[PDB]
Nucleic acid binder design. Structure first.
Lengths: 99, 97, 111, 82, 99, 82, 108, 97
DNA sequence: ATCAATATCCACCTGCAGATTCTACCAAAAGTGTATTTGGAAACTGCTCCATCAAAAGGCATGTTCAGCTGAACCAGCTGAACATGCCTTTTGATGGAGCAGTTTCCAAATACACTTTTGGTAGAATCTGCAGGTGGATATTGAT
DNA sequence: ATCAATATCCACCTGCAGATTCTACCAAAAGTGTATTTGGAAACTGCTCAACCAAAAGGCATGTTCAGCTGGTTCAGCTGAACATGCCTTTTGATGGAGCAGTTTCCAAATACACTTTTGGTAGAATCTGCAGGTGGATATTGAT
């Protein structure tokens, strides 16, 4: 019978692994496509430098990690371990990210 | 004889108020708040215009830099109506030399 | 020596274009300032003042008051999404807050 | 490709990001909300970047335009010049 | 026997009353004395203008009301109606008020 | 006898502030935490205000010094000049 | 025509006083710039640079690496209370985050 | 023949690194990060000094405004050690004329 | 507490991908001497600030009571972590030509500056009226029945 | 439903503190004219970007299993919300000198600004070496028992 780890052990292994390294976790190509589609609705036939896309990816990723950190603290606050949309909405509301 | 001289936007705010609501006054505190508001928006716009000019190795602040600064700082329809007023004002100024 | 006409009247504005020009020169913003910049800026400031005073006068009429006080300015700003965004981190002295009570603590319905 | 859009930002990548945030367990409904949040952030930044681009009469968005757009939102980025 | 309201009704009356009005809720004199003590620990024999004290009072109260709003959302999030120190600590941590 | 002087920000005033915040019920331990929070905020502001005082070679703290100190903390205050 | 000395050497600094002076003049900060301002500023920048590099070098030795990389700078900044305050809202490219897992969820 | 000229703080950062840790190098990306850092702190300090000068109706930026700005922007012991270094530097400059 | 099955370290080799150093030259740092503003020292002065009383009253410090609240188990779905298998978008390597970012040069138009000259702005004095308090009455709510 | 003790809305009145207007002095806003410099626009070029096929390959989709997570239910302290009571800290004139924030005027002193003379910093080319990548074993981490 195959060896089987209980739920949570591997998640923790991924946390330690990804917190030890610095490489980018989102794929480059779909990010470029998303950027180009959004940019199209403001101005047509725009081009992008590759370092501009790397900068946007770094900014996006740093923003999301910070939000997941705040979300996790809100989840833990409610005696839960599962993050839910209402936690994200709370974090963004308190920072003033009013969308 | 000593007496200094402190400027404010009070008289202009009162003129605009009388234009928009002829039958209405304003307290001194509120006028002070409006003056603070005006000063804050002035610094924000001029500072942003300054950074744009510096980034583009440009030594002049023109109406273009103001327009761009406005589009960056203000959201949607507020920006569109303000930009329209500024454009119309500049065209009126340039015509009536 | 033609007769003195102000820049404000030429622009059809109430705000002082000349003073704004002096303030741009004095304040280390740029070495030189174009003629159109203060007209545009004055127009923007005048428009925003008219919008705030408009909403504040509506709030004034709602409270049957003919004089605008700071409270009305706070109500005007916080009830307008765009002004709230612009002034989201700004404190209006003597402004107070909006009559906002979170819906779930106010009293029970089968009562 | 499934939306020609944000859906290319797949579930496992969002999971990885949550892992870097120290999150152990994730509800199935988080992903779409995160996508929307990301899209909003991106829109505002790109809007300002393109505005700087338009001011210079340039058709190429540079890294510096992004850095300044990020700066005005209080998210100063180091490492890409200036 | 004296007439007696249930817990919560008058609290709500106080909410409506103070949210309708704008008068300062902290006493002027203790605030002045607090300010003078703190300033004394940085520089001696300082004086203060009355409007400086009023400005500080307005700032303090606006800051505290905003923090209590965020605190209340954090309490409600935990399926509670009572705010606790951990709610304030969470709100300040998410704003980055790290102290 | 007086009470270390931080205590003049009494319990009922804090209760009133919480009421303006829409708070209905308050634990007894909130007050001391709130006092510390207020002290930190005040300490930072006055420090900057006094720094502005010292630079001007003035012995009177003006409203403008406070306004600037608040501006640098991202808590811009309107109504007291500038 | 005495021999050419520079201000960084006279001030006992490594950072370039002259360039800082030119940058102050160019950037619309003030109409005129005093002689001492760029020296003081250069000294402050040198002290702060030395402090960051010091901590990053310590982090570098803990990882048995002889070259400083961005990760070591992020670790240095977030582990210093004062630098974290100064750079609390700054993003360090390729920095990552601190190995911080909230205690209650880590296993029994 | 065309060639431009882009300045950076690279050479000075490398000299300081060799003074503090002789047996250590630095990657180009990290050096770029340090240059960005220096530019940011420069802009912050000069901008703050400018506002102080404007508030007190002074047209000159001196070592005093730098000192005050430093005390405002930087926290506690970091400020004290940096301020001490600046004072030491100005004192050595003024004496070795 | 020990075996089983993975995970990740401890340690080494190689060579190569950036990283450090060498050579050149020119653009910025620095020196010299003139011209120009500016910080500070001292005199004037009257506006505003700390300290004291004084009498009161309105908030608050203490004490008493109980009603919803808080935490705490128990458990019935239930849905969300892990793996297999397998299919495929993404990635790495090429290719190469097209557009334009960026540099250089020139000149009408834009704009600073010095002198002059009229006048809109602002401070204090003189109205004047809108709302802060006060009185009475009339609904409109809580809560025991 | 009923119904009695408080809270709040609303009509009306009053008068005075602050809003509004009037009248004066002048620093600042326009007008002329002249000197400065700079932004638009055209030419060029080689650095960078969009397209784009081939392959390989590591990542994502779908489906299955089942483990423990979460919200509904309920229950015994509990403790924090309202009142009553007395009291003492805070409010609001009034005084009333002390000191210092302006304000001006003078004058050494710090610093722009034109010109001249080097030389430190950076762009390209020539060496260099620390760790990315790969691998071989040696222990650390949990699941089932």
């Amino acid at each position: 019978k195959p060896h089987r780890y209980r739920p949570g052990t591997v998640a923790l292994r991924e946390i330690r692994r990804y917190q030890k390294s610095t490489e980018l976790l989102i794929r480059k190509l779909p990010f470029q496509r998303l950027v180009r589609e959004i940019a199209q609705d403001f101005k047509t036939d725009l081009r992008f430098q590759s370092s501009a896309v790397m900068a946007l990816q770094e900014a996006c990723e740093a923003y999301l990690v910070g939000l997941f950190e705040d979300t996790n603290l809100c989840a833990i606050h409610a005696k839960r371990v599962t993050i839910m949309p209402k936690d994200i909405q709370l974090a963004r509301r308190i920072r003033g990210e009013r969308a | 004889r000593k007496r200094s001289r402190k400027e404010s936007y009070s008289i202009y705010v009162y003129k605009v108020l009388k234009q928009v609501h002829p039958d209405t006054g304003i307290s001194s505190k509120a006028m002070g708040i409006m003056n603070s508001f005006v000063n804050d928006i002035f610094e924000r716009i001029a500072g942003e215009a300054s950074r744009l000019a510096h980034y583009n190795k440009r030594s002049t602040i023109t109406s273009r830099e103001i327009q761009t600064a406005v589009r960056l700082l203000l959201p949607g329809e507020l920006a569109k109506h303000a930009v329209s007023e500024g454009t119309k004002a500049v065209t009126k100024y340039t015509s009536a030399k | 020596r033609a007769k003195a006409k102000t820049r404000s009247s030429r622009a059809g504005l109430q705000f002082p274009v000349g003073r704004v020009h002096r303030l741009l020169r004095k304040g280390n913003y740029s070495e030189r300032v174009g003629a159109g910049a203060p007209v545009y800026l004055a127009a923007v400031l005048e428009y925003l003042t008219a919008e705030i005073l408009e909403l504040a006068g509506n709030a004034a009429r709602d409270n049957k008051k003919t004089r605008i006080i700071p409270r009305h300015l706070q109500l005007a700003i916080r009830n307008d999404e765009e002004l709230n965004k612009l002034l989201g981190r700004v404190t209006i002295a003597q402004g107070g807050v909006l009559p906002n009570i979170q819906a779930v603590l106010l009293p029970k319905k089968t009562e | 490709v499934l939306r020609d859009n944000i859906q290319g930002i797949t579930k496992p990548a969002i999971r990885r990001l949550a892992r870097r945030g120290g999150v152990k367990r994730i509800s199935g409904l988080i992903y779409e909300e995160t996508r929307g949040v990301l899209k909003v952030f991106l829109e505002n930044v790109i809007r300002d970047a393109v505005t700087y681009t338009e001011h210079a009469k340039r058709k190429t968005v540079t890294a510096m335009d992004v850095v300044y757009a990020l700066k005005r939102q209080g998210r100063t980025l180091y490492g890409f010049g200036g």
